[PDB]
Design a protein around this ligand. Structure first.
Ligand SMILES: NC(=O)C1=CN([C@@H]2O[C@H](COP(=O)(O)OP(=O)(O)OC[C@H]3O[C@@H](n4cnc5c(N)ncnc54)[C@H](O)[C@@H]3O)[C@@H](O)[C@H]2O)C=CC1
Ligand SMILES: Cc1cc2nc3c(=O)[nH]c(=O)nc-3n(C[C@H](O)[C@H](O)[C@H](O)COP(=O)(O)O)c2cc1C
Ligand code: SF4
Ligand code: SF4
Ligand code: SF4
Ligand code: SF4
Ligand code: SF4
Ligand code: FES
Ligand code: FES
Lengths: 439, 156, 226, 120, 225
């Protein structure tokens, strides 16, 4: 695998010894060139239009158009206080892309935030980084100091009169803080409950001001667009999703890892050519395409292009595009129990279906794993999947929670019925009172 | 009787400068107190609330919301083993069993000499190198149950 | 604004949400977290109704009536099968941890949670696992605290903090262990803390002065007074 | 537990009681009076009782000379055993804490978890 | 000038379709037992010749009844305080047939003149202490301070002092000082008030021994005793 700047815009400046690339080395391999072009030759409106015509979608997992999200900021000049937030939370199980991006290429993220903040006219930027990424925090703070020293951040950046302060906000460990409105609440020093939309953060976000929240990888995608042009970015691949995505496969494969690939490469290409296939003595059973909140898929879906639309039609989600392989030795009930335990304990507690229905599924799956399941348990799980879907809950944490459960029941129902061994009993006998025996 | 030190108070005010609302420094104020003293004691809630000008109920709601802000005393070193799905596939259960056998405690407990606090944590974002765990600021990957007693011995 | 509810045309205020518009018309939608004086937040998810964009739409989508404007041309169904099943499921989820406390609870016969449990038609328990529990706090001479009965509707904190500007009540903890109360034991310092006993839809916050000589609401002789 | 369900369920209205509380917090009737000159022995109070406290028993010989003596107070009603239902204990099911039964000790109850607990 | 009190409520002959307004819910219990220890003969329900309400459940409390005086809110299926929804025109608005009560006077067409009696500034003078009123929600009202549940909520009696005046008297926080007002030498522990202007002592109005008429009055012989 070779990495040219044309085919690997995100990972071609990665070093072989996995060491971080600092300002002199980054600028040696065409660093802050897109920032220079954007800040010295383009108005913010045509930068937003350039990103929109590049077709850059959200790399956080939902695939929303970045230029469309940037264009939804208010047009009035009265609202001159604006915020750009980098979602460096990355708490989805199976996701390790942003750690790679921030640990050894922090200046790529800094340049992306600088370009995006100039496009959004955002006077301030915050990197909402998870607390467990100590190396990313150290490298990002060092790169911010280096960019401030060499006039790339602060007051009068490149002589253009544009002021931009970049801060790093380290988190305190909750998965719901990655949700963008809960991210905004956590940045304001509150409990990280999400907020209802509309209004979207573009009109009233952080402290009521116009705010744009973007993933690490999205902001890392913008400087190559600004440096090499829109036409280069459109012709990376012949797919509906433009550009390159950090894809990977993890879990008992020969070479678990992370590779920058164009959209539309099949999951079998990632699994066999890049991940090396399954390990010796292990047979492929299932896979999750885009993190812990996506539906399981079988071996028949391995010949599917890794795009939002193609994975969407197969009853799953592209997600973070960091797939996880499940071998034959893994009990699916135990796997879904582990997933649901994570999802139930990471509930923010705002809304009833997630907060009180995910623990019910956890207890049912614990009983099924122990062989103490009772009739009606699987139907209860299916009803929980139906009633925790999109729109039933306040945010999208619970639909993502119930995607693997419903897909595992759909594809591996025989393992769930194997846990139902005891008859259903909810009552004890009360002496003197004859029960109402249903038929 | 809790009193914020001069270093703690100056760090909290310096973080108050970073936002347009001093309430936005509550998480990092709790983290500053935790970094200095291992955890956030009860009087620290009122001290931080007094510094930031927000109610103590808001500070305590923040402190008890976030899992890495400790409102109970912990050991000198906090072990945080990942119990999420990829490390479950990669066999974190053997790692948890080895840690429990070496430390003779349960998750959420602290060893009787106050050295180690064992805690499950969500995914550490290192799933290609699992199973993973985190001692205080150091992440250890590619864990095996045999390397656990040796690797725990370097934290005194 | 003209709305349609279950095939019936109604004239409502377009500046109102659907829950307050439908309750003003005499229709019954169960609700917990909304209050007329506090606004809508969409927490409890109890007020679900099915919404249709056109009259010639049969699929629909469940929405929160408290979070949905009662604009012109909306079609909703309260008595839709999926809406009724979801509202019953929300009540059932609230019932999974609720203590077996109604005989020794001061809210009984005056309890909004009892009324909405009956209103949704949920009377059969199939949850068989453990119920979470909480310790209580001493809140002073006026308000008695029983957090086992909480449904986490956030009404108390919204009233006390946003409406009454009180500082010593809050929400603590996380997912299913959310706790509503003071940061420590002590008297509630707001001069309007007593409205919690009517704001709270359960028996968490109760009138301690009435609890000393307690009687049920049906046994009371009332009069309008000043 | 002086819950007053039997009094309101009585179609005659011949039950009158008042709630009182012990120091540990258990509810009990301060008084409990039944007008047996009014009572029709319909059994609706026993059916409405959620603790099986009030029970109609196989005894019909209640003739009296003065009908003021048909007003039975709590001293004339409370027997020294469980009656028709030998084992049911309402307080073993209730979440409310009393003496000898703390939070988390009732049936189907988990132990309380403090919000300050280190586990996620 | 009190002619508007006729319309504050309808008179005792008011009916809802011939029936009076009920004071108690329809499921009111214990009618043949609640007085049975006194006498097994049930008396008549007490009569209300004064108002339109009846001392029984044999009356009207419908949410659609044309009245303004609602003794309690109840509707079938709504037993909580949420039953007030059914009694309003719209939820959170007015009672559906008007709120009870009537204003005695309207806004006058013409106003007053400016009051030209501007007082001079406050001057502290030696040996003379101006009484600053300190009211308490729990304590300053006579009847409610008689209630036994308010005794725990009521503050301990005190006298507020400026730090400068307390230093001039040689008095710290918590020490008891005695002062005489109209032949009543009473003693009170001192609380230091930063915001109270010097030359004043703060007194809790309406408590035991501190009448609210003392607001704005003076004080003599305030000494540590
Ligand atoms: N660690 C991670 O990266 C994790 C990622 N996810 C991903 O999160 C996704 C769900 O996140 P959501 O924010 O709920 O998705 P979404 O579809 O609601 O919105 C995504 C983005 O588009 C914007 N947006 C969408 N519609 C908009 C509109 N009409 N006007 C303005 N802005 C609009 C939102 O503000 C947000 O920034 C999933 O696809 C999942 O894969 C989930 C969990 C963890
Ligand atoms: C429960 C939940 C957790 C999320 N966590 C993250 C996260 O950790 N990082 C992230 O970039 N997006 C996360 N998202 C998606 C964000 O809400 C949002 O879509 C994203 O941060 C910014 O959008 P973008 O992809 O266009 O950059 C999460 C969403 C949900 C519902
Ligand atoms: S689904 Fe509801 S309770 Fe769960 S994380 Fe989202 S808002 Fe919070
Ligand atoms: S809060 Fe309501 S439902 Fe719960 S025990 Fe009390 S009366 Fe029963
Ligand atoms: S204590 Fe009462 S008002 Fe507060 S969230 Fe719980 S049920 Fe709602
Ligand atoms: S049996 Fe007697 S006391 Fe019991 S409900 Fe019937 S009439 Fe009333
Ligand atoms: S006898 Fe039963 S129904 Fe009557 S008050 Fe006592 S516990 Fe309640
Ligand atoms: S699943 Fe353990 S590090 Fe991600
Ligand atoms: S009343 Fe609408 S969600 Fe609670």
């Amino acid at each position: 695998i070779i990495r040219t700047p044309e085919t690997h815009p995100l990972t071609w400046r990665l070093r072989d010894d996995k060491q971080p690339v600092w300002l002199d080395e980054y600028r040696s391999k065409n660093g802050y060139e897109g920032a220079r072009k954007a800040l010295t030759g383009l108005s913010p409106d045509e930068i937003v239009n350039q990103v929109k015509d590049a077709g850059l979608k959200g790399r956080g997992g939902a695939g929303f158009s970045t230029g469309l999200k940037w264009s939804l900021m208010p047009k009035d000049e009265s609202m001159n206080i604006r915020y750009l937030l980098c979602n460096a939370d990355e708490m989805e199980p199976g996701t390790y892309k942003d750690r790679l991006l921030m640990e050894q290429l922090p200046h790529l993220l800094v340049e992306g935030m600088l370009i995006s903040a100039f496009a959004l006219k955002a006077y301030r930027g915050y990197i909402f980084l998870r607390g467990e990424y100590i190396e990313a925090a150290v490298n990002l703070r060092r790169a911010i100091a280096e960019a401030t020293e060499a006039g790339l951040l602060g007051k009068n950046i490149m002589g253009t009169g544009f002021d931009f302060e970049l801060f790093v906000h380290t988190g305190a460990g909750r998965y719901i803080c990655g949700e963008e409105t809960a991210l905004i609440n956590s940045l304001e020093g509150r409990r990280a409950n999400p907020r209802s939309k509309p209004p979207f953060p573009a009109t009233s976000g952080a402290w009521g001001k116009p705010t744009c929240v973007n993933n690490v990888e999205t902001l890392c995608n913008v400087p190559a667009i600004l440096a090499n042009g829109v036409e280069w970015y459109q012709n990376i691949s012949k797919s509906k999703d433009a550009g390159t995505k950090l894809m990977g496969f993890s879990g008992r494969v020969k070479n678990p890892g992370l590779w920058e690939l164009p959209f539309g490469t099949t999951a079998r290409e990632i699994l066999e050519d890049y991940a090396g296939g399954m390990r010796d003595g292990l047979k492929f059973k299932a896979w999750q395409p885009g993190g812990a909140g996506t539906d399981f898929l079988t071996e028949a879906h391995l010949d599917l292009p890794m795009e939002f639309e193609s994975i969407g039609k197969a009853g799953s989600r592209l997600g973070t595009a960091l797939a996880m392989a499940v071998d034959h030795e893994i009990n699916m009930v135990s796997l879904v129990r582990n997933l649901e335990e994570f999802f139930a304990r990471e509930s923010c507690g705002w809304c009833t279906p997630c907060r009180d229905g995910l623990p019910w599924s956890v207890k049912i799956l614990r009983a099924l794993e122990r062989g103490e399941g009772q009739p009606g348990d699987i139907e209860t799980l299916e009803q929980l999947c139906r009633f925790l879907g999109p729109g039933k809950t306040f945010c999208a944490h619970a639909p993502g929670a119930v995607e693997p459960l419903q897909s595992a029941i759909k594809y591996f129902r025989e393992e769930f019925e194997a846990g139902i061994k005891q008859p259903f009993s909810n009552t004890h006998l009360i002496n003197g009172i004859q029960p109402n025996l249903l038929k | 009787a809790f009193e914020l030190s001069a270093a703690e108070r100056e760090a909290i005010e310096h973080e108050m400068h970073h936002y347009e609302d001093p309430r936005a420094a509550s998480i990092e104020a709790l983290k500053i107190v935790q970094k200095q003293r291992g955890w956030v004691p009860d009087g620290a809630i009122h001290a931080i609330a007094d510094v930031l000008g927000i109610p103590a109920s808001d500070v305590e709601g923040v402190a008890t919301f976030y899992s890495q802000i400790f409102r109970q005393p912990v050991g000198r070193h906090v072990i945080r083993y990942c119990d999420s799905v990829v490390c479950h596939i990669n066999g974190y259960q053997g790692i948890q069993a080895a840690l429990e056998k070496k430390l003779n405690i349960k998750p959420g407990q602290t060893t009787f000499d106050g050295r180690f606090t064992l805690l499950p944590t969500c995914c550490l974002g290192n799933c290609d190198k699992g199973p993973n765990m985190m001692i205080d600021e150091d992440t250890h990957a590619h864990l095996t149950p045999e390397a656990i007693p040796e690797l725990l011995e370097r934290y005194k | 604004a003209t709305i349609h509810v279950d095939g019936k045309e109604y004239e409502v205020n377009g500046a109102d949400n659907l829950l307050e518009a439908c309750l003003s018309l005499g229709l019954d939608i169960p609700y917990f977290c909304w209050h007329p004086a506090l606004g809508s937040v969409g927490a409890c998810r109890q007020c679900a109704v099915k919404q249709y964009q056109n009259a010639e739409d049969t699929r629909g989508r469940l929405v929160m009536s408290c979070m949905t404007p009662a604009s012109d041309g909306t079609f909703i169904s309260i008595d839709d099968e999926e809406a009724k099943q979801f509202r019953e499921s929300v009540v059932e989820w609230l019932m999974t941890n609720h203590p077996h406390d109604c005989p020794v609870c001061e809210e009984g016969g005056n309890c909004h949670l009892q009324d909405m449990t009956v209103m949704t038609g949920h009377s059969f328990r199939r949850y068989r696992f453990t119920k979470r529990t909480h310790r209580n706090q001493d809140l002073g001479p006026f308000i008695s605290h029983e957090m086992n009965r909480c449904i986490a509707c956030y009404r108390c904190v919204r009233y006390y903090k946003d409406y009454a500007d009180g500082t010593d009540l809050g929400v603590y903890g996380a997912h299913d262990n959310v706790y509503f109360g003071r940061p420590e034991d002590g008297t509630l310092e707001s001069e309007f803390s007593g409205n919690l006993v009517e704001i709270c839809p359960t028996g968490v916050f109760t009138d301690k002065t009435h609890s000393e000589r307690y009687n049920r609401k049906w046994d009371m002789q009332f009069a309008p007074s000043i | 537990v002086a819950c007053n369900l039997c009094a309101v369920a009585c179609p005659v209205g011949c039950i009158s009681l008042q709630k009182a509380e012990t120091k540990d917090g258990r509810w009990y009737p301060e008084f409990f009076r039944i007008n047996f000159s009014r009572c029709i022995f319909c059994g609706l109070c026993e059916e409405a009782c959620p603790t099986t406290a009030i029970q109609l028993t196989p005894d019909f010989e209640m003739g009296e000379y003065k009908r003021q003596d048909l007003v039975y107070e709590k001293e004339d009603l409370l027997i020294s055993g469980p009656g028709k239902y030998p084992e049911y204990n309402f307080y073993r099911m209730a979440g409310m804490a009393i003496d000898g039964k703390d939070k988390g000790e009732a049936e189907n109850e988990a132990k309380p978890i403090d919000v300050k607990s280190l586990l996620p | 000038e009190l002619a508007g009190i006729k319309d504050a409520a309808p008179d005792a002959t008011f009916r809802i379709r011939g029936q009076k307004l009920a004071r108690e819910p329809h499921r009111y219990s214990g009618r043949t037992a609640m007085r049975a220890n006194i006498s097994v003969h049930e008396p008549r329900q007490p009569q209300d010749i004064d108002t339109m309400f009846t001392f029984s459940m044999e009356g009207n409390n419908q949410p659609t009844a044309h009245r303004s005086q609602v003794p309690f809110a109840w509707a079938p299926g709504w037993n909580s305080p949420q039953a007030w929804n059914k009694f309003q025109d719209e939820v959170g608005g007015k009672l559906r047939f008007g709120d009870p009560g009537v204003r005695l006077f309207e806004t006058s067409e013409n106003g007053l003149d400016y009051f030209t009696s501007v007082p001079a500034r406050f001057q502290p003078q030696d040996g003379k202490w101006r009484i600053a009123p300190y009211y308490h929600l729990f304590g300053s009202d006579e009847l409610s301070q008689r209630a036994p549940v308010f005794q725990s909520r009521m503050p301990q009696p005190y006298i507020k002092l400026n730090p400068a005046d307390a230093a001039k008297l040689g008095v710290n926080a918590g020490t008891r000082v005695s002062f005489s007002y109209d032949g009543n030498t009473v003693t009170l522990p001192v609380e230091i008030a930063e915001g109270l202007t010097a030359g004043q002592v703060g007194l809790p109005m309406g408590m035991s021994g501190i009448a609210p008429v003392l607001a704005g009055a003076h004080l003599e012989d305030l000494k540590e005793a």
